[PDB]
RNA sequence: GUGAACAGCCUCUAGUUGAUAGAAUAAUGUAGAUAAGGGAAGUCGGCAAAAUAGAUCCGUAACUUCGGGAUAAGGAUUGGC
RNA sequence: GCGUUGGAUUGUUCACCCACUAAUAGGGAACGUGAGCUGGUAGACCGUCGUGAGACAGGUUAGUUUUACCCUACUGAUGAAUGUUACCGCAAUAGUAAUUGAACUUAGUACGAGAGGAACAGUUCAUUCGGAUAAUUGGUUUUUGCGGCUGUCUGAUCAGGCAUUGCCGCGAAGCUACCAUCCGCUGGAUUAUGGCUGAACGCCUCUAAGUCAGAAUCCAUGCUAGAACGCGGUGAUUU
RNA sequence: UGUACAACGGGGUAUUGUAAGCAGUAGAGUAGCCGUUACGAUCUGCUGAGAUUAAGCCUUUGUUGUCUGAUUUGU
C-alpha cells in the first residue's frame, strides 16, 4: 500500500547489509538497514529486493539530526541486470537510495540522477520529484 | 519494435539480443554482445580495433558519406499515416539498398585495382629469381610426358 | 486464501464455464472438423490424377486346455 | 463506462485505442504500420517527400551508369603472363 | 578472469572520456574543478585534482609527478580527437549522417581550438604555480 | 525432537519413483472425455522438438500492465509433419478395467512402421503384414467382422497412427507407432471414420489452431546418476567436513533404525516422463508457404528456420506448430500434444495472440543478423566474391 | 641466460626416461581454479581463501630506556625504441 | 490440508532485544542411566587451604580415534524361467501438491453526526514450494578456437617447445542460475453449524425413523511408477 | 547394392581480430656523404585478412572406398 499497482518482478540486488548511494541534499550520503516490505519468509535466505521496493535504511554519512534514525525508503537504481519485459536488460551505474514515509512521500523535494521507469511509474511521488526518468 | 545499433560494433540490436547500459547522464549504451560490453568496460578504442565500423569509415574501408545513406534519418516529426505513402516507402528501401550495394561494390574494386600488377611483379620476381627450381620443374614435366 | 479445491471459486468457475468459454471451445471443434473434412477431399482429388476362425480358435483352445491341465485358471478350477 | 458496462465488465472489455483517430480514409480503420523490414526500420525512411528524393536518386544513378562507373601487361601477352604464374605457384608450393 | 573482473567492476567505474571533452570544452568547468571548496571527504582535501586524469592527488608534488609521466600522456593522446559518441557509432552503420558531420565539423571549427587553449591554459597555470 | 525451526520439504513425494523412463515415447495416460453430441476429432498429435526462438507480441490483455504494449517471450518449435492412419483398436468396459478385444490394421503400410515392428531390418525378408493383406481379400469378411464387433461392443475408440519421420532432418528412419482416442460420437461413425482414412494423412491444422491451450507429454532429458544437493535441491555442507559436503549430513539426534523413502537419497536424474499442460499455441505455419518467420508487421520473406539451421537439428520444410515457453524433453525427441481435459476459464486461452517477429537468427553464436542477405548487405563485399 | 641473488624458470656437459598397464569420463572424494550483484547477513570464532607484495621518488604519528617505532601509515611511477 | 523467518548480544543465553511477516503455535521420535557433526588426563600461572608432598570455593591458558569392502534398510540399475520374437495397451497396489499476500473494479458505495470505511460476483500480478527448460542475459573454458605477454631454447625471420593447464583478453558448443524463462485442475461424500418434515411427551422440538445445504477436510478426476510369478489385443513364425 | 554407409573435400553458419612475404619515406632521432644514403620500437597498404569451424552445428549433383563375420531359438 501507498504505491499504485501490482507486485511486479524485477531481478533483486539489495540484499541486507548493503551500503546504497543518495544523491538528494536531504543531507544523507549513504543507506544501509535490515527490512524489506513484501519480502518472504525462508530458512536460511536473505530479504533482498528491488522493483522500486521499500526498505529500511539508516544514514551511515550524513547529518546527526537524520543519523541514528531508521527510516523507510525506495530503491531507484540497482546496478544488477535487470530484464525489461519490452526487450532488453537494464543496468544502471550504482545503486540509489533515496528518503521517504511510509505513503510514498519524500521527506526531500527533488532528485539527482536518473530514477527506474518502473519505479517512477509504481511511486508517485518519485516521479514528480524526478527531473531524469531512465 | 526498433533495431538499435550496438555503440562499438555499430551492428543491429534486436530486441531480445544485448545488454543496456544506463549513465549518470541519462545516457544509453547498448551493445550486440558480451564481446563489446566488456570491451567498453576496459575502456577500449572503437576507432583502434579493426573489427567495428568506425574504424573502416574513419580509415577508408566501405564508403561513409553517399545520398543514400541519409534516407535513414531519425524522425522526430510525425505524419498522418498514409498507406500509400508507406507501400511506397516499402519499394523505395529495397531500391534503395540495391543502389547502395552497388556503389558499395565500386568503392571495393576502387581499393582493390592494382592489385593484379603487384602479384604479376611478384610472380616475375620469384621466377627470375629462383630458375634452379625450373630446371626440376622441366625435366619432370619432360619425365611425366616420357612416362604417359 | 481460497484454496484451488474451494467450493465457492468452483462454483463460480462451473458458472462462467457454461457461458463465454464453452462458445469458444465449441466453434474450434466445426473449424477444425472443417478442416479435417477438407484435408480427406484434397488426398482424394490427389488419389484421382492417375470364432475369428483362422488361427485364434486353436491358439484358444490350447491355452484353455494348457490352464485346465496345470490348473491355472482364474474362473475355471 | 457504460458501454464497458455492456461490453464486459472492468478486466475483460478490451478497448480499441483506435475509432478516435483522425483519417482521410475512414475505410482504412484496421491497418497496421509496418515496422521493420530485411535490416531497416520504417519510421526511419518514412518520409512525406521520399519520392522526389528518389527521383533523384534515380537521376544521379542514371548519369553514373552512362558515365565510367560500373566498368595483359605489356611485354607479356597472356599465356606469358599464365606461364609466370603458374611457376611461381609451383615455386611457393 | 580476476584482472578486468576486479578492476573494471561498475563499482570501480570511472569517467567516461565524452564528459571528460565536455568538461574541458569551456571555461566556467574548468575554472570550477581547479577551484574546488574544501571537502573533507576528496582525497586532496578538493585542491589538486587532475581534470584529463579525473583524479585527485594528495599534494602539488604528486601532481607534478603524475602530469610527467606516460599515464597523463596517454589521456591527453586519446582526447586530442572527437570522443566517439552513439552518433559516431551509427553514422558507420547508415543512420543520422548528417548530425554526425555537423558535430563533426563543429568540433573542427568551435569546439576543438577551444578546448585547446583551454588545456593550453590549463598546462602553463600549473607548470606556473608548480 | 521439535527441529527448533521449520521449513518445508525437500523435493515433491508426488513425482517418485526417480528411475529412467520405460519408453523414448512417453504414454498418454488420459485422454478428454467424450462428448457424442459434437463432430469426430482426434484428441491429440504428435511431433518433434526442434530448439527454441524468441518472439515479440502486442498484448491486448485487459488489467494487466502491459496492456496495448510489446512484450518479447520464448517460444518452442514442434516439426508436425502429417500423421499417417493404419490402424483401429476399440476398447470394452469390464470391472477390471478397460480391455482390447480388436484391433484392425491397413491394407497396405510403409517401410517406415515395419521398421518400427522389426529390430534388425537390413537382414529380414520383411514378411511383417503379408498375410494381413492377405486377409484383405475380395470381400474382407474378417476385416468387416472385427469392425462390427468394434461397433457393437467396445464402448471407445482409439486409432493406431505413425509419423512421416523421412521428412525430418532426423538420421533414424523407423518411425513411431500411438494410439490416439477419436472424442465425436456414434461409435459407427468413429469406425466409418477411421475406415475411410486409413492410408491417409491427418494434418496438425486438422486437430489444432492459434490460441489453443494444448498439453505436452514427453521425457526429460537424462544426465545420469546425480547427486543429493543437485537432484533435491539440499544445502551444502560449509567446507572440508568429514566423509564430504554435497549429501545430507544426517537425520539429526533422534534414533530411528531404518532409512526412510523420504531423505533425499542419489541417482537418476531425468529421463522421466512429465505432463505439462497449458501451453498456447502462437502459430500453425505451414510449409508449402514460405514467410513463415514473417509478419504482419515485418514483411521480410523468410522461414522460421534460423541461419545455420536449428542446433542438433536441421531444417523446418514442414507444417510446425508453435508454442510459448518451455516443454519437457530436447531435441529431437518425440512429443505428443493434447488438448487440455478440461474448458479452461481463464482469459489467456481467449486472447488472440498476434505477432509482430520473430527470431531467424543463428543459435550456434550470438546471432546478429536475420538472413543471409542482411549479412551480404551488413558486412558489405568482401576479398571471395570479386 | 633472466635477476640483488647457490632463490624460482629454461638450457649446455654428464645421467635418466625408473614408479603395473589399457578403455571410458557417473556420483562422492583428493589436489587446484573462476564466478554476476551484495560484501561477514556466515560461523563459537572472518577458520580457510582473497587482497598486499619487487625496485625509484615523496612522505611518515603517538610513544620512547633517545638507541628505536619505521618498509609506520599514506601517495606518484615502472614496457619498447 | 498448507506454512510457521531474517538478524544483534559469550564482562554468557536454563534468555532477551528490534524488525520483516498472513503468522513468526507448542511438543515427540535422544535427554525414562550412557550413543552422529560443533562449542562449552600429562604442561604452566594467580587465588583459598595445607608444616609439606598436595588438595581445591575458584579463575586463566594450551592440549592425536582413524568403518561400510559384510548383512539389512534406502536410493537408482540389470536379469533366468513361464513355445520364440516384436508391437500397441489395461491398471490392482503404492505415492500425490500446491500455498499465501497484495492490486483494479464492486466504491469513497453499504455503514456512520463525524473521523473513517468492508465484502460477494468480474479481473491482474506477485510470495513460499514443486517440475521442466536453455530463445535471450549472466557465469563457466583443455574447443588449449583466435590473438597477445614475460623468461629461456631451437643461429635470425617463420613455425614452435618448457614454465605441474605458465599468464592476460575475447571465446562458441555443452552444462547451468527465481542471477534466466515457462507451467502448476475439478467431481462426489462429509465435520462444526444453519435448517425441512416430525414423534418421543394430546404443546414444542434439526432427530429418534427420514431429509437440504455446508470447511483449506475425506474419496475420487488429474500426475508418477507399473505386479520383474497381474492381464489383454495384434504382426511374423526357421530350405 | 541403394535418391545406402563412411572418410575426405566444397558451401553456410559461428569464434577471433587483420596472417606470412613484399613495398613505402609515415617514422622520435642518430651517424656517413654534398639536401641525400644506412640504422631504427612503430605506422600505412595488398588484408574483416589469416586461422579454426563437430569432436553431441546445418547442408551436400564432388573424389575415394565399404556392404553375408559368430552364436542361439519351435506352439
Ligand atoms: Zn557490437
Ligand atoms: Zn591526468
Redesign the pocket.
Given at each position: 500500500?501507498g504505491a499504485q499497482?501490482?507486485?511486479?518482478?524485477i531481478?533483486?540486488?539489495?540484499?541486507?547489509?548493503?551500503?546504497?548511494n543518495c544523491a538528494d541534499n536531504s543531507g544523507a550520503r549513504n543507506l544501509y538497514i535490515?527490512?524489506?516490505?513484501?519480502?518472504?519468509?525462508?530458512?536460511?535466505?536473505?530479504?533482498?529486493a528491488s522493483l522500486g521496493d521499500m526498505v529500511?535504511a539508516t544514514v551511515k554519512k550524513g547529518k546527526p539530526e537524520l543519523r541514528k534514525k531508521?527510516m523507510p525508503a525506495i530503491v531507484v537504481r540497482?546496478?544488477?541486470?535487470w530484464?525489461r519485459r519490452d526487450g532488453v536488460?537494464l543496468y544502471f551505474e550504482?545503486?540509489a537510495g533515496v528518503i521517504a514515509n511510509p505513503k510514498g512521500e519524500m521527506k526531500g523535494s527533488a532528485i539527482t540522477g536518473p530514477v527506474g521507469k518502473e519505479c517512477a511509474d509504481l511511486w508517485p511521488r518519485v516521479a514528480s520529484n524526478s527531473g531524469v526518468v531512465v | 519494435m526498433r533495431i538499435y545499433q550496438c555503440h562499438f560494433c555499430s551492428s543491429p540490436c534486436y530486441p531480445?539480443?544485448?545488454?543496456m547500459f544506463v549513465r549518470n547522464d541519462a545516457k544509453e549504451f547498448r551493445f550486440c554482445?558480451?564481446?563489446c560490453?566488456?570491451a567498453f568496460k576496459?575502456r577500449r578504442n572503437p576507432r583502434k580495433?579493426?573489427?567495428t565500423?568506425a574504424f573502416?569509415k574513419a580509415?577508408?574501408?566501405?564508403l561513409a558519406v553517399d545520398s543514400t545513406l541519409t534516407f535513414a534519418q531519425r524522425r522526430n516529426v510525425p505524419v498522418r499515416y498514409n498507406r500509400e505513402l508507406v507501400a511506397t516507402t516499402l519499394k523505395a528501401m529495397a531500391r534503395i539498398e540495391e543502389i547502395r550495394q552497388k556503389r558499395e561494390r565500386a568503392f571495393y574494386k576502387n581499393?582493390?585495382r592494382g592489385?593484379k600488377e603487384?602479384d604479376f611483379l611478384r610472380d616475375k620476381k620469384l621466377v627470375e629469381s629462383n630458375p634452379e627450381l625450373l630446371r626440376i620443374r622441366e625435366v619432370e614435366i619432360a619425365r611425366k610426358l616420357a612416362k604417359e | 486464501?481460497?484454496?484451488?479445491?474451494?467450493?465457492?471459486?468452483?462454483?463460480?468457475?462451473?458458472?462462467?464455464?457454461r457461458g463465454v468459454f464453452q462458445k469458444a471451445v465449441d466453434a474450434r471443434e466445426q473449424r477444425i472438423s472443417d478442416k479435417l473434412k477438407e484435408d480427406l477431399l484434397k488426398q482424394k482429388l490427389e488419389d484421382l490424377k492417375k470364432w475369428?476362425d483362422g488361427?485364434?480358435h486353436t491358439?484358444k483352445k490350447?491355452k484353455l486346455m494348457?490352464q485346465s491341465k496345470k490348473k491355472t485358471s482364474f474362473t475355471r478350477f | 463506462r457504460d458501454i464497458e458496462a455492456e461490453n464486459?465488465?472492468?478486466?475483460?472489455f478490451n478497448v480499441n485505442l483506435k475509432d478516435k483517430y483522425l483519417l482521410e480514409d475512414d475505410e482504412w480503420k484496421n491497418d497496421i504500420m509496418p515496422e521493420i523490414l530485411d535490416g531497416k526500420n520504417v519510421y526511419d525512411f518514412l518520409d512525406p517527400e521520399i519520392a522526389a528524393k528518389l527521383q533523384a536518386l534515380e537521376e544521379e544513378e542514371e548519369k553514373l551508369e552512362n558515365e565510367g562507373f560500373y566498368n595483359i601487361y605489356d611485354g607479356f601477352e597472356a599465356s606469358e603472363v599464365d606461364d609466370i604464374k603458374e611457376k611461381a605457384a609451383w615455386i611457393r608450393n | 578472469?580476476?584482472?578486468?573482473?576486479?578492476r573494471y567492476?561498475?563499482?570501480r567505474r570511472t569517467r567516461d572520456l565524452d564528459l571528460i571533452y565536455n568538461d574541458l570544452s569551456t571555461k566556467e568547468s574548468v575554472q570550477k574543478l581547479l577551484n574546488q571548496p574544501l571537502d573533507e571527504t576528496k582525497?586532496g582535501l578538493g585542491q589538486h585534482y587532475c581534470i584529463h586524469?579525473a583524479?585527485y592527488?594528495?599534494?602539488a608534488?604528486?601532481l607534478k609527478?603524475?602530469l610527467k609521466?606516460?599515464?597523463?600522456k596517454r589521456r591527453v593522446k586519446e582526447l586530442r580527437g572527437v570522443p566517439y559518441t552513439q552518433e559516431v557509432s551509427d553514422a558507420a552503420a547508415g543512420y543520422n549522417l548528417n548530425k554526425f558531420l555537423n558535430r563533426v565539423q563543429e568540433i573542427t571549427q568551435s569546439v576543438g581550438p577551444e578546448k585547446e587553449s583551454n588545456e593550453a591554459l590549463l598546462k602553463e597555470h600549473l607548470d606556473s604555480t608548480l | 525432537?521439535?527441529?527448533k525451526?521449520?521449513?518445508?520439504?525437500?523435493?515433491?513425494?508426488?513425482?517418485?519413483?526417480?528411475?529412467?523412463?520405460?519408453?523414448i515415447?512417453?504414454?498418454?495416460?488420459?485422454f478428454p472425455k467424450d462428448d457424442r453430441s459434437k463432430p469426430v476429432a482426434l484428441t491429440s498429435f504428435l511431433g518433434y522438438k526442434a530448439?527454441?526462438?524468441?518472439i515479440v507480441r502486442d498484448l491486448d490483455?485487459?488489467?494487466?500492465?502491459?496492456h496495448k504494449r510489446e512484450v518479447?517471450?520464448?517460444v518452442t518449435v514442434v516439426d508436425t509433419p502429417p500423421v499417417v492412419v493404419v490402424g483401429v483398436?476399440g476398447?470394452v468396459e469390464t470391472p477390471?478395467?478397460?480391455?482390447?478385444?480388436?484391433?484392425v490394421?491397413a491394407e497396405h503400410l510403409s517401410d517406415e512402421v515395419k521398421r518400427?515392428?522389426?529390430?534388425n531390418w537390413y537382414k529380414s525378408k520383411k514378411?511383417?503384414?503379408?498375410?494381413?493383406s492377405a486377409?484383405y481379400a475380395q470381400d474382407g469378411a474378417g476385416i468387416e467382422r472385427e469392425l462390427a464387433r468394434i461397433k457393437k461392443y467396445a464402448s471407445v475408440v482409439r486409432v493406431?497412427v505413425h509419423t512421416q519421420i523421412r521428412k525430418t532432418?532426423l538420421?533414424q528412419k523407423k518411425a513411431?507407432?500411438?494410439?490416439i482416442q477419436l472424442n465425436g460420437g456414434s461409435i459407427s461413425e468413429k469406425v466409418d471414420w477411421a475406415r475411410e482414412h486409413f492410408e491417409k494423412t491427418v494434418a496438425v491444422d486438422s486437430v489444432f489452431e492459434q490460441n489453443e491451450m494444448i498439453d505436452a507429454?514427453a521425457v526429460?532429458?537424462g544426465?545420469?546418476?546425480?547427486?543429493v544437493?543437485?537432484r533435491?535441491?539440499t544445502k551444502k555442507l560449509?567446507?572440508?567436513?568429514?566423509?564430504?559436503?554435497?549429501?545430507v549430513?544426517?537425520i539429526?539426534?533422534?534414533?530411528?533404525a531404518?532409512?526412510?523413502?523420504s531423505?533425499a537419497?542419489?541417482?537418476?536424474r531425468?529421463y522421466?516422463?512429465?505432463?505439462?499442460?497449458?501451453?498456447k499455441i502462437y502459430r500453425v505455419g505451414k510449409g508449402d508457404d514460405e514467410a513463415n518467420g514473417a509478419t504482419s508487421f515485418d514483411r521480410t520473406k523468410k522461414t522460421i528456420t534460423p541461419?545455420?539451421?536449428?542446433?542438433?537439428?536441421?531444417?523446418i520444410k514442414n507444417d510446425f506448430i508453435m508454442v510459448?515457453?518451455?516443454?519437457?524433453?530436447?531435441?529431437k525427441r518425440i512429443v505428443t500434444l493434447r488438448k487440455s481435459?478440461?474448458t479452461?476459464?481463464?482469459?489467456?486461452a481467449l486472447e488472440e495472440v498476434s505477432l509482430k517477429w520473430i527470431?531467424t537468427?543463428?543459435?550456434?553464436?550470438?546471432?546478429?543478423?536475420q538472413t543471409?542477405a542482411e549479412?551480404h548487405a551488413?558486412?558489405?563485399?568482401?576479398?571471395?566474391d570479386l
Open positions: 500500500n499497482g501490482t507486485k511486479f518482478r531481478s533483486l540486488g539489495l540484499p541486507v547489509g548493503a551500503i546504497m535490515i527490512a524489506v516490505k513484501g519480502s518472504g519468509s525462508r530458512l536460511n535466505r536473505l530479504p533482498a529500511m531508521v540497482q546496478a544488477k541486470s530484464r536488460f550504482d545503486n | 531480445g539480443h544485448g545488454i554482445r558480451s564481446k560490453h566488456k576496459q580495433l579493426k573489427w565500423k573502416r580509415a577508408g574501408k566501405e581499393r582493390m592489385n603487384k | 486464501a481460497k484454496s484451488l479445491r474451494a467450493s465457492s471459486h468452483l462454483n463460480a468457475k462451473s458458472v462462467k464455464r475369428r488361427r485364434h491358439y490350447a494348457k | 464486459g465488465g472492468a478486466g475483460v | 578472469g580476476r584482472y578486468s573482473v576486479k567492476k561498475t563499482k582525497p586524469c583524479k592527488m594528495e599534494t608534488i604528486a609527478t603524475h609521466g606516460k599515464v597523463h | 525432537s521439535h527441529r525451526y521449520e521449513a518445508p520439504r525437500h523435493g515433491h513425494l508426488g513425482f517418485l519413483p526417480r528411475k529412467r523412463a520405460a519408453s515415447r512417453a504414454r498418454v495416460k488420459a530448439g527454441m526462438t524468441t490483455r485487459p488489467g494487466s500492465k502491459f518479447v517471450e520464448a483398436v476398447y477390471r478395467g478397460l480391455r482390447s478385444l480388436t484391433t490394421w518400427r515392428f522389426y529390430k514378411k511383417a503384414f503379408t498375410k494381413y486377409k493406431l532432418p538420421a513411431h507407432l500411438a494410439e507429454i526429460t532429458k544426465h545420469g546418476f546425480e547427486g544437493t543437485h533435491w535441491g560449509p567446507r572440508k567436513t568429514h566423509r564430504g559436503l554435497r549429501k549430513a544426517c539429526g539426534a533422534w534414533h530411528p531404518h532409512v526412510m523413502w531423505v537419497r542419489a541417482g537418476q531425468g522421466h516422463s512429465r505432463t505439462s499442460i497449458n501451453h541461419m545455420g539451421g536449428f542446433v542438433h537439428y536441421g531444417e510459448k515457453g518451455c516443454i519437457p524433453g530436447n531435441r481435459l478440461y479452461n476459464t481463464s482469459r489467456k527470431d537468427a543463428s543459435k550456434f553464436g550470438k546471432g546478429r543478423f543471409p549479412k551488413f558486412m558489405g563485399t568482401l576479398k571471395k
